[PDB]
Amino acid sequence: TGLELLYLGIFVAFWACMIVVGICYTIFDLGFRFDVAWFLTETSPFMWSNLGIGLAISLSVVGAAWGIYITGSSIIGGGVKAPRIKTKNLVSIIFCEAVAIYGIIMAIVISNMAEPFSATDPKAIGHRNYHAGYSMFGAGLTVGLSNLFCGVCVGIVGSGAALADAQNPSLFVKILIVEIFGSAIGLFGVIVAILQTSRVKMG
Amino acid sequence: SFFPELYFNVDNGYLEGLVRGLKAGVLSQADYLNLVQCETLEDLKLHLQSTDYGNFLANEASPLTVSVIDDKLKEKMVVEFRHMRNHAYEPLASFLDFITYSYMIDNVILLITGTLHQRSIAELVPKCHPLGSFEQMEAVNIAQTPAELYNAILVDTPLAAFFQDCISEQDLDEMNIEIIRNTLYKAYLESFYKFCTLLGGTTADAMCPILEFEADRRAFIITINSFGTELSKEDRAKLFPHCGRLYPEGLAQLARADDYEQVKNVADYYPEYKLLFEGAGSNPGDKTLEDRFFEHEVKLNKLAFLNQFHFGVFYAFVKLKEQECRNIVWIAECIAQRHRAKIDNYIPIF
Amino acid sequence: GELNKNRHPN
Amino acid sequence: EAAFSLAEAKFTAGDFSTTVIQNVNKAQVKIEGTDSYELTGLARGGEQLAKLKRNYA
Ligand SMILES: CCCCCCCCCCCCCCCCCC(=O)OC[C@H](COP(=O)([O-])OCC[N+](C)(C)C)OC(=O)CCCCCCCCCCCCCCCCC
Ligand SMILES: CCCCCCCCCCCCCCCCCC(=O)OC[C@H](COP(=O)([O-])OCC[N+](C)(C)C)OC(=O)CCCCCCCCCCCCCCCCC
Ligand SMILES: CCCCCCCCCCCCCCCCCC(=O)OC[C@H](COP(=O)([O-])OCC[N+](C)(C)C)OC(=O)CCCCCCCCCCCCCCCCC
Ligand SMILES: CCCCCCCCCCCCCCCCCCCC(=O)O[C@H](COC(=O)CCCCCCCCCCCCCC)COP(=O)(O)OCCN
Ligand SMILES: CCCCCCCCCCCCCCCCCCCC(=O)O[C@H](COC(=O)CCCCCCCCCCCCCC)COP(=O)(O)OCCN
Ligand SMILES: CC(C)CCC[C@@H](C)[C@H]1CC[C@H]2[C@@H]3CC=C4C[C@@H](O)CC[C@]4(C)[C@H]3CC[C@]12C
C-alpha cells in the first residue's frame, strides 16, 4: 500500500492546508481575497466546455474498457472448458461498448454547442456564455461518470453471468436482465446531459 | 467493503474462470451413483471415462489396482494445481503456496522421520506428496544428519517461519513426530488465517470460515484422540489453533476436558458444532464424528463458490477435488473388497 | 514390528 | 474385516502407511506395552485408525 500511502498523504496534506487556509482567510478579515466569483468568472468558459467534452468521451471510454476487460477475463477463463461462452456472452461486451458509444454521441451533442466570444471582460462574456460553459462542463461530468459507473457495473454483472454460464447454459438468458438494468443507468446519464445542454448557447 | 470487483480480474480473472471450470468437472451425485453401481474396477474405469476424468486411466495396466487409481487421481490433481499456480501472480501465488504448505508440513515430517531412523533422504522423496515437493537441493544429500536437515529447512524451505515455533534442531529428536507435525500445522494455519485476513474483502469473508472450522475440528479431534495417550493437557492445549471460533474459553475448556462427554458439552455452546456432534452417533453403522466434519467441510468449500471475486475458490476447489479423489478411492476399495454395504459412505459433492 | 540390534526389520 | 477397516482408515487419516512403516521402534506384541503409534491419527485419523488397530490386534 505504498502508493495508497502516497495518495493518502497527499489528500490529508492538501485538505489540512485547505482547512488552515480557510481559517486564516476567515479570521484575518481577508475573506474578500477568497473571491470564488473571480475564480469562476476569469477562468475562461472554454476551459470548462472543453474539459466537459473531454470527460464526456474519456470517462465513458474508461468505463467501457473497465467493463470490457472485467467481463472478458471471465469469458476467456470460463471458455477454456466451455467454449460456447465466447459465442453467447459477447452480448455483455456489447453492452459495455454501448456505454462508450453514448459518450461520443453526447460529446457531439456538447461539442455542437461551442462558439467563440471575441470578448474577455466578464460583463462582455455574459451570463449566457458563462452558463453555457458551466452547463457543458456539468453535462460532460454527468455523462462521463454515469457511463463510467454503468460500464463497470455491466462488466461486473457480465463476468458473473459468464462464470454462471460456464456451468449451466440456461442461466445467462435469465441473468442478462441484470445487465439490462445496469445498462439503464447509462441512458439516464445521457438523458440528463441532454437536459443540461438543451438551452445552452455560446457566442 | 474492499471493492475486489474493480481490480480482481486484472490479474486473477482468467484463473477465477479456469478454476470454476475445473470445479464444474467434479463428479455430481448422479456420477457417484453410476460409479457405485459398478461391479469391477475395470467397470469403474469405464463409468469414470464418461466424466471429466476421461482417459486418465486408459494408459495404465489392464489389471487395475486401487493404488494405481489413487496415484492417477493424485497426479491429475497435482498437474491441475501446478498449471494453475504457474499462471498465477504474486498474491494468488502466495495463496497457492500457502495451500501447498499443508502438504510440505507432512513431507518435512517424513524427511525427519527417515533421517532420524537413518534412511537415505533421497529414498524418501518418492513417498512425499507431489504438491509439497522439496525441489530445493539444500535439503537433499543431507548425509542423514538431523542438524543439517534442520538447517536446510530453515534456509531453503518456506517452513522456516513455522519452525521458529520450535526452539532448536534438538527438538527433532526430542518431541514426537506427531507433536512436531501438529505444532507446525498450528503455526501454518495461524499464518494462513492472518494472510487471508490481510487480503480482506471477499477473500477474507469466504476463506476465514473455512480456516475457522479447520481450527475448531483440529481442536475437537486432538482432544478426542489424546484422551488415552500420554499427551498431557498442558502440551495438548499447545496444539489447538487460535483461529477457530472456540478461542475465548472454548479451547481452554477443551484443554481441561477429560472425556468425550466433556468435549460434547464444550461443543454444545456452538450450534453449528452441536449438530455435528449430535449426528455423530459413532456406533457401528452410522456416520462418525470425522465423517460429519468432512460433510461440514465439504459444505463450507461448496459455499465458498457463491462468492465471485476472491481467492478462496482455489482452496475450495483443491479441497473438493481432494475429497472427490478420496471418494473415488473409497468406491474402488468397496468394489475390490466386495463390501457393497458401506459403499454409500462417500461424501457427495454438488 | 521391531528393529533388532542390527536394526534389521522383521 | 481388518482390511476393510484399513481402507476406512485411509479414507480419513490419509496416507499413514509410510508413517506406520517408518516409526517401527520396538514390538508391542511378541511370542510388551511399548506402543509406538499413539498420536498417529491425533488430528485426522482418530477413531477409524484406533478401530483399525483393534481389528488387526
Ligand atoms: C504533502 C503532499 C504534497 C502537497 C500537496 C498539497 C498542496 C497544497 C496546496 C497549498 C496551497 C495553499 C494556498 C496558499 C495561499 C493561501 C495562504 C493563506 O491562507 O494565507 C494567506 C492569506 C492571505 O494573505 P494576504 O492576502 O494578506 O497577503 C497579501 C497577498 N499576497 C501575499 C498575495 C501579496 O492569509 C494570510 O495572510 C495568512 C498568513 C499566514 C499564512 C498561513 C497559511 C496557512 C497554512 C499554514 C500552515 C500549513 C498548512 C498545512 C499544515 C501541515 C501539513 C498538514
Ligand atoms: C500543531 C501545528 C503547529 C501550529 C502551526 C502550524 C503552521 C502554521 C504556520 C504557517 C506559516 C505562517 C507564519 C506567518 C507568516 C506571516 C503571515 C503574516 O504576515 O500575517 C499577516 C496575517 C494577515 O494580515 P493581518 O490580519 O496581519 O493584517 C490586517 C488585515 N486586516 C486589516 C484585513 C485585518 O495576519 C497576521 O498578522 C498573522 C500572524 C500570525 C499567523 C500565524 C500562522 C497562521 C496559522 C497558525 C496555525 C492555525 C491553526 C492553529 C491551531 C493548531 C492546533 C493543532
Ligand atoms: C475536509 C473536508 C472539507 C471541510 C473542511 C475544509 C472546508 C473549506 C476548504 C476550502 C478552502 C477554505 C474555504 C474557506 C475560505 C474562506 C472564506 C472567507 O474568508 O469568507 C468567509 C465568509 C465571508 O467572510 P467575510 O470576511 O466576507 O465576512 C462577511 C462580511 N460581510 C458580510 C460584511 C461581507 O464567511 C464565513 O466565515 C463563511 C464560513 C466559511 C469560512 C471558514 C472555513 C472553515 C474551514 C474549516 C474549519 C472550520 C473551523 C472549525 C473546526 C472544526 C470543524 C468541525
Ligand atoms: C504519511 C506521512 C505524511 C506524508 C506527507 C507527505 C506527502 C506524501 C508523501 C509520501 C509519504 C509516505 C511515503 C510514500 C512514498 C511513496 C509511495 C511508496 C513508495 C513508492 O513510490 O514506490 C512504489 C511506487 O513507485 C514510485 O516511486 C511511484 C510514485 C511516484 C509517482 C508520482 C506521481 C504522483 C504525483 C502526485 C499527484 C497525484 C495526486 C493523486 C491524489 C510503491 O511501492 P509499492 O506499494 O508497489 O511497494 C510497497 C512499498 N513501496
Ligand atoms: C465544517 C466544514 C466547512 C463548512 C463551511 C463551508 C465551506 C465551503 C468552502 C467554500 C468557501 C466558503 C464559502 C463562503 C466564502 C465565499 C467567498 C466570499 C468572498 C467574497 O467576498 O467574494 C464575493 C464573491 O464570492 C461569492 O459570492 C462566491 C459565492 C459562492 C461561495 C460558495 C462556493 C464554494 C464552492 C462550492 C463547490 C461545490 C461543488 C459541488 C460538487 C465578492 O463578490 P462581489 O460581487 O462583491 O465582487 C466584487 C468585485 N468587484
Ligand atoms: C507542504 C505542503 C502541504 C504545502 C505547504 C503549505 C502552505 C499552504 C503554506 C506553507 C508556508 C506558507 C506561507 C508562509 C508565509 C507567507 C507569507 C505571507 O505574507 C503570505 C502567505 C505565505 C506566503 C504563506 C502561504 C501558505 C504557505 C505556502
mmCIF file of C-alpha atoms in Angstrom, chain A:
data_model
loop_
_atom_site.group_PDB
_atom_site.id
_atom_site.type_symbol
_atom_site.label_atom_id
_atom_site.label_comp_id
_atom_site.label_asym_id
_atom_site.label_seq_id
_atom_site.Cartn_x
_atom_site.Cartn_y
_atom_site.Cartn_z
ATOM 1 C CA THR A 1 0.000 0.000 0.000
ATOM 2 C CA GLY A 2 2.907 2.334 -0.679
ATOM 3 C CA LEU A 3 1.097 4.134 -3.488
ATOM 4 C CA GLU A 4 -2.038 4.182 -1.345
ATOM 5 C CA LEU A 5 0.087 5.739 1.395
ATOM 6 C CA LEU A 6 1.317 8.403 -1.031
ATOM 7 C CA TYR A 7 -2.224 9.210 -2.168
ATOM 8 C CA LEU A 8 -3.495 9.347 1.416
ATOM 9 C CA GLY A 9 -0.625 11.611 2.426
ATOM 10 C CA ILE A 10 -1.266 13.987 -0.465
ATOM 11 C CA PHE A 11 -5.001 14.058 0.286
ATOM 12 C CA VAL A 12 -4.518 14.669 4.015
ATOM 13 C CA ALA A 13 -1.870 17.340 3.454
ATOM 14 C CA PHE A 14 -3.979 19.136 0.853
ATOM 15 C CA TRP A 15 -7.104 19.178 2.996
ATOM 16 C CA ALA A 16 -5.281 20.168 6.190
ATOM 17 C CA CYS A 17 -3.759 23.015 4.181
ATOM 18 C CA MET A 18 -7.230 23.925 2.929
ATOM 19 C CA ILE A 19 -8.681 23.924 6.447
ATOM 20 C CA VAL A 20 -5.879 26.117 7.789
ATOM 21 C CA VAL A 21 -6.038 28.442 4.772
ATOM 22 C CA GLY A 22 -9.790 28.877 5.140
ATOM 23 C CA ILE A 23 -9.409 29.530 8.858
ATOM 24 C CA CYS A 24 -6.726 32.144 8.179
ATOM 25 C CA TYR A 25 -8.742 33.866 5.445
ATOM 26 C CA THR A 26 -11.925 33.949 7.523
ATOM 27 C CA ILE A 27 -10.295 35.044 10.768
ATOM 28 C CA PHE A 28 -7.861 37.667 9.443
ATOM 29 C CA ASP A 29 -10.747 39.514 7.732
ATOM 30 C CA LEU A 30 -9.216 38.592 4.359
ATOM 31 C CA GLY A 31 -12.308 36.836 3.038
ATOM 32 C CA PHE A 32 -12.627 39.375 0.235
ATOM 33 C CA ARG A 33 -9.443 37.874 -1.238
ATOM 34 C CA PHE A 34 -11.161 34.468 -1.488
ATOM 35 C CA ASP A 35 -13.236 35.588 -4.462
ATOM 36 C CA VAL A 36 -14.884 32.423 -5.729
ATOM 37 C CA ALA A 37 -16.678 34.748 -8.147
ATOM 38 C CA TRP A 38 -13.334 35.868 -9.559
ATOM 39 C CA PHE A 39 -12.230 32.255 -9.996
ATOM 40 C CA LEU A 40 -15.431 31.131 -11.720
ATOM 41 C CA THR A 41 -15.554 34.274 -13.872
ATOM 42 C CA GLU A 42 -11.994 34.996 -15.023
ATOM 43 C CA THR A 43 -11.479 31.306 -15.787
ATOM 44 C CA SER A 44 -12.403 31.014 -19.445
ATOM 45 C CA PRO A 45 -15.670 29.225 -20.315
ATOM 46 C CA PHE A 46 -13.675 27.400 -22.978
ATOM 47 C CA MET A 47 -11.764 25.538 -20.272
ATOM 48 C CA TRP A 48 -14.993 24.299 -18.700
ATOM 49 C CA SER A 49 -16.610 23.350 -22.010
ATOM 50 C CA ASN A 50 -13.572 21.515 -23.376
ATOM 51 C CA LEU A 51 -12.959 19.698 -20.097
ATOM 52 C CA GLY A 52 -16.625 18.732 -20.245
ATOM 53 C CA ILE A 53 -16.362 17.276 -23.746
ATOM 54 C CA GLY A 54 -13.070 15.549 -22.994
ATOM 55 C CA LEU A 55 -14.509 13.972 -19.859
ATOM 56 C CA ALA A 56 -17.758 13.013 -21.600
ATOM 57 C CA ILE A 57 -15.768 10.938 -24.069
ATOM 58 C CA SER A 58 -12.813 9.788 -21.958
ATOM 59 C CA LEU A 59 -14.682 8.670 -18.832
ATOM 60 C CA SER A 60 -17.229 6.824 -20.965
ATOM 61 C CA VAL A 61 -14.381 5.043 -22.746
ATOM 62 C CA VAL A 62 -12.737 4.308 -19.387
ATOM 63 C CA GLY A 63 -15.915 2.681 -18.114
ATOM 64 C CA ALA A 64 -16.360 0.750 -21.344
ATOM 65 C CA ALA A 65 -12.788 -0.569 -21.166
ATOM 66 C CA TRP A 66 -13.108 -1.385 -17.460
ATOM 67 C CA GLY A 67 -16.241 -3.420 -18.061
ATOM 68 C CA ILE A 68 -14.852 -4.988 -21.224
ATOM 69 C CA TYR A 69 -11.760 -6.358 -19.512
ATOM 70 C CA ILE A 70 -13.636 -7.278 -16.318
ATOM 71 C CA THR A 71 -16.021 -9.455 -18.327
ATOM 72 C CA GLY A 72 -13.534 -10.592 -20.981
ATOM 73 C CA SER A 73 -11.151 -12.081 -18.444
ATOM 74 C CA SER A 74 -14.026 -14.165 -17.072
ATOM 75 C CA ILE A 75 -15.307 -15.042 -20.553
ATOM 76 C CA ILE A 76 -11.916 -16.280 -21.735
ATOM 77 C CA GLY A 77 -11.218 -18.088 -18.471
ATOM 78 C CA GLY A 78 -14.527 -19.916 -18.491
ATOM 79 C CA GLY A 79 -14.351 -20.741 -22.185
ATOM 80 C CA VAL A 80 -11.285 -22.953 -21.717
ATOM 81 C CA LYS A 81 -13.633 -25.765 -20.653
ATOM 82 C CA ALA A 82 -16.902 -24.412 -22.137
ATOM 83 C CA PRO A 83 -16.002 -22.560 -25.346
ATOM 84 C CA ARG A 84 -19.683 -21.930 -26.121
ATOM 85 C CA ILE A 85 -19.388 -18.949 -23.762
ATOM 86 C CA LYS A 86 -17.373 -16.984 -26.312
ATOM 87 C CA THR A 87 -20.337 -17.194 -28.694
ATOM 88 C CA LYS A 88 -23.151 -16.323 -26.298
ATOM 89 C CA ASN A 89 -21.648 -13.856 -23.822
ATOM 90 C CA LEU A 90 -20.375 -11.292 -26.329
ATOM 91 C CA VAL A 91 -23.645 -9.516 -25.527
ATOM 92 C CA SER A 92 -22.090 -8.495 -22.220
ATOM 93 C CA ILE A 93 -19.161 -6.944 -24.085
ATOM 94 C CA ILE A 94 -21.633 -5.278 -26.441
ATOM 95 C CA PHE A 95 -23.371 -3.601 -23.515
ATOM 96 C CA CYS A 96 -20.045 -2.314 -22.211
ATOM 97 C CA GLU A 97 -19.145 -0.935 -25.627
ATOM 98 C CA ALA A 98 -22.600 0.637 -25.869
ATOM 99 C CA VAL A 99 -21.558 2.861 -22.965
ATOM 100 C CA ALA A 100 -18.663 4.294 -24.965
ATOM 101 C CA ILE A 101 -20.998 4.982 -27.884
ATOM 102 C CA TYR A 102 -23.232 7.147 -25.712
ATOM 103 C CA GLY A 103 -20.094 9.012 -24.708
ATOM 104 C CA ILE A 104 -19.161 10.040 -28.234
ATOM 105 C CA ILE A 105 -22.765 10.925 -29.040
ATOM 106 C CA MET A 106 -23.008 13.210 -26.034
ATOM 107 C CA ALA A 107 -19.589 14.623 -26.870
ATOM 108 C CA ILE A 108 -21.018 15.575 -30.252
ATOM 109 C CA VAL A 109 -24.185 16.932 -28.661
ATOM 110 C CA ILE A 110 -21.945 19.005 -26.402
ATOM 111 C CA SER A 111 -19.322 19.940 -28.989
ATOM 112 C CA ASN A 112 -22.079 21.374 -31.200
ATOM 113 C CA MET A 113 -22.836 23.993 -28.516
ATOM 114 C CA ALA A 114 -19.387 25.632 -28.609
ATOM 115 C CA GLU A 115 -18.703 29.021 -30.174
ATOM 116 C CA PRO A 116 -16.058 31.737 -29.609
ATOM 117 C CA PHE A 117 -16.876 35.054 -27.949
ATOM 118 C CA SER A 118 -14.417 37.728 -29.092
ATOM 119 C CA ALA A 119 -14.733 39.089 -25.546
ATOM 120 C CA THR A 120 -12.659 38.901 -22.372
ATOM 121 C CA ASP A 121 -14.400 41.212 -19.906
ATOM 122 C CA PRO A 122 -16.842 39.175 -17.763
ATOM 123 C CA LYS A 123 -19.570 41.741 -18.406
ATOM 124 C CA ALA A 124 -18.825 41.205 -22.100
ATOM 125 C CA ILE A 125 -18.674 37.402 -21.858
ATOM 126 C CA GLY A 126 -22.033 37.474 -20.117
ATOM 127 C CA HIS A 127 -24.386 35.143 -18.312
ATOM 128 C CA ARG A 128 -25.225 33.239 -21.492
ATOM 129 C CA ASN A 129 -21.614 32.328 -22.259
ATOM 130 C CA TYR A 130 -20.674 31.579 -18.647
ATOM 131 C CA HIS A 131 -23.717 29.350 -18.157
ATOM 132 C CA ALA A 132 -23.000 27.664 -21.487
ATOM 133 C CA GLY A 133 -19.503 26.797 -20.308
ATOM 134 C CA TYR A 134 -20.649 25.623 -16.882
ATOM 135 C CA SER A 135 -23.502 23.545 -18.306
ATOM 136 C CA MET A 136 -21.270 21.929 -20.924
ATOM 137 C CA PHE A 137 -18.835 21.020 -18.144
ATOM 138 C CA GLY A 138 -21.645 19.663 -15.979
ATOM 139 C CA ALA A 139 -23.161 17.647 -18.821
ATOM 140 C CA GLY A 140 -19.740 16.230 -19.616
ATOM 141 C CA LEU A 141 -19.270 15.245 -15.984
ATOM 142 C CA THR A 142 -22.736 13.691 -15.789
ATOM 143 C CA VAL A 143 -22.444 11.637 -18.966
ATOM 144 C CA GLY A 144 -18.838 10.618 -18.359
ATOM 145 C CA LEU A 145 -19.260 9.490 -14.765
ATOM 146 C CA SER A 146 -22.662 7.860 -15.284
ATOM 147 C CA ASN A 147 -21.188 5.968 -18.239
ATOM 148 C CA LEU A 148 -18.117 5.029 -16.192
ATOM 149 C CA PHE A 149 -20.202 3.550 -13.387
ATOM 150 C CA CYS A 150 -22.638 1.891 -15.807
ATOM 151 C CA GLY A 151 -19.797 0.297 -17.758
ATOM 152 C CA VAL A 152 -18.090 -1.001 -14.627
ATOM 153 C CA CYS A 153 -21.394 -2.352 -13.288
ATOM 154 C CA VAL A 154 -22.262 -4.051 -16.572
ATOM 155 C CA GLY A 155 -18.782 -5.554 -16.688
ATOM 156 C CA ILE A 156 -19.108 -6.993 -13.188
ATOM 157 C CA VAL A 157 -22.545 -8.420 -13.970
ATOM 158 C CA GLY A 158 -21.250 -9.814 -17.262
ATOM 159 C CA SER A 159 -18.338 -11.535 -15.548
ATOM 160 C CA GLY A 160 -20.781 -13.057 -13.083
ATOM 161 C CA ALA A 161 -23.056 -14.177 -15.914
ATOM 162 C CA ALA A 162 -20.130 -15.692 -17.827
ATOM 163 C CA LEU A 163 -18.996 -17.649 -14.773
ATOM 164 C CA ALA A 164 -22.589 -18.828 -14.287
ATOM 165 C CA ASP A 165 -22.883 -19.751 -17.973
ATOM 166 C CA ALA A 166 -19.789 -21.965 -17.833
ATOM 167 C CA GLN A 167 -21.686 -24.319 -15.503
ATOM 168 C CA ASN A 168 -25.326 -24.121 -16.640
ATOM 169 C CA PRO A 169 -26.370 -22.942 -20.131
ATOM 170 C CA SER A 170 -29.909 -21.969 -19.088
ATOM 171 C CA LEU A 171 -28.823 -19.181 -16.697
ATOM 172 C CA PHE A 172 -27.421 -16.457 -18.964
ATOM 173 C CA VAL A 173 -30.834 -15.794 -20.513
ATOM 174 C CA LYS A 174 -32.147 -15.007 -17.019
ATOM 175 C CA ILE A 175 -29.083 -13.092 -15.789
ATOM 176 C CA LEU A 176 -28.951 -10.741 -18.791
ATOM 177 C CA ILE A 177 -31.875 -8.924 -17.171
ATOM 178 C CA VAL A 178 -29.498 -7.587 -14.530
ATOM 179 C CA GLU A 179 -27.217 -6.270 -17.268
ATOM 180 C CA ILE A 180 -30.205 -4.542 -18.854
ATOM 181 C CA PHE A 181 -30.900 -2.825 -15.544
ATOM 182 C CA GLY A 182 -27.222 -1.981 -15.219
ATOM 183 C CA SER A 183 -27.370 -0.511 -18.711
ATOM 184 C CA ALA A 184 -30.312 1.783 -17.957
ATOM 185 C CA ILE A 185 -28.118 3.989 -15.766
ATOM 186 C CA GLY A 186 -26.021 4.902 -18.783
ATOM 187 C CA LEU A 187 -29.109 6.043 -20.665
ATOM 188 C CA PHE A 188 -30.245 8.045 -17.649
ATOM 189 C CA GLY A 189 -26.977 9.957 -17.626
ATOM 190 C CA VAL A 190 -27.285 10.728 -21.323
ATOM 191 C CA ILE A 191 -30.833 11.979 -20.823
ATOM 192 C CA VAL A 192 -29.747 14.276 -18.010
ATOM 193 C CA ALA A 193 -26.850 15.560 -20.091
ATOM 194 C CA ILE A 194 -29.252 16.307 -22.937
ATOM 195 C CA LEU A 195 -31.437 18.187 -20.469
ATOM 196 C CA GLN A 196 -28.468 20.172 -19.150
ATOM 197 C CA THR A 197 -27.332 21.391 -22.589
ATOM 198 C CA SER A 198 -30.827 21.798 -24.052
ATOM 199 C CA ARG A 199 -30.780 25.609 -23.756
ATOM 200 C CA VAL A 200 -27.023 26.221 -23.979
ATOM 201 C CA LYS A 201 -25.767 28.788 -26.486
ATOM 202 C CA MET A 202 -22.247 30.210 -26.600
ATOM 203 C CA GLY A 203 -21.387 33.257 -28.684
#
